[PDB]
């Protein structure tokens, strides 16, 4: 939901 990008 927040920036979950690895």
């Amino acid at each position: 939901a927040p920036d979950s990008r690895p």
Epitope: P2, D3, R5
Partner: single-chain antibody, 224 residues
Framework: QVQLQESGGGLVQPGGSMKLSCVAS????????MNWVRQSPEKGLEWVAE??????????HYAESVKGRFTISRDDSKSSVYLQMNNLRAEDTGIYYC????????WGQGTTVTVSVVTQESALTTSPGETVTLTCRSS?????????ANWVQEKPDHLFTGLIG???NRAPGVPARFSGSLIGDKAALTITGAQTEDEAIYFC?????????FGGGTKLTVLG
């Protein structure tokens, strides 16, 4: 090394205006949301604003304390994020940082601005090779993976780096001794064999739909 470098801070009179900048290098800036967070003389961190991606039309969210006085923006072809601050007041005094990535892996050095609930353990003492556990509790109810708990380390003095994001994901290059968890209804960070260099303040942050709340921070003393 990744690098975020803030500028534009200084000394301002109440009622005044100031624009901060932050330039990113050494990674793909435009793939990540960015945030401003501010520390403040009482120690303690307060999230200020976020901005998302182009594909989100650069949507933004602000803490209520700054809503309508501050504006966050970004320029991807410049690798930059900005914080326009109007109507400053004494209580905006602090050190401001741009930070992002999974979800607070990277932090700038901070730029100082002088204008002139989440619960953690207060303090813990350890020594090298002991195991220590820090906890992060929510008054609103149970902490879950939907809160994307982060843990961030502040070394002496004002040097921040993200340790854990998404509850249990070590950020890249973080030493293996730092271990994130959900335990019962709390998030927790375990240092599995502390080292002398881990003396620092450890903050957690939880996500509540569209804003972050940072805890008060736990002061870790490491003897020996």
């Amino acid at each position: 090394q990744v690098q975020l470098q803030e500028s534009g801070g200084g000394l301002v009179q109440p009622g005044g205006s100031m624009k901060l900048s932050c330039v990113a290098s050494g990674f793909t800036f435009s793939n990540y949301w960015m945030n401003w967070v501010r520390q403040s003389p009482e120690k303690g961190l307060e999230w200020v604003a976020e901005i998302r991606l182009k594909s989100n039309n650069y949507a933004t969210h602000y803490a209520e304390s700054v809503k309508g006085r501050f504006t966050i923006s970004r320029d991807d072809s410049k690798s930059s994020v900005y914080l326009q601050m109007n109507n400053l007041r004494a209580e905006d005094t602090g050190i401001y940082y741009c930070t992002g990535v999974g979800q607070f892996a990277y932090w700038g050095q901070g730029t100082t601005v002088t204008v002139s609930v989440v619960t953690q353990e207060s303090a813990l003492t350890t020594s090298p090779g002991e195991t220590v556990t820090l906890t992060c509790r929510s008054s609103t109810g149970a902490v879950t993976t939907s809160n994307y708990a982060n843990w961030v380390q502040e070394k002496p003095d004002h040097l921040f780096t993200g340790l854990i994001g998404g509850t249990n994901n070590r950020a890249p290059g973080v030493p293996a001794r730092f271990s994130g968890s959900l335990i019962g209804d709390k998030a927790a960070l375990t240092i599995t064999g502390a080292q002398t260099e881990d003396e620092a303040i450890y903050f957690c942050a939880l996500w509540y739909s569209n804003h972050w709340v940072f805890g008060g921070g736990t002061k870790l003393t490491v003897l020996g």
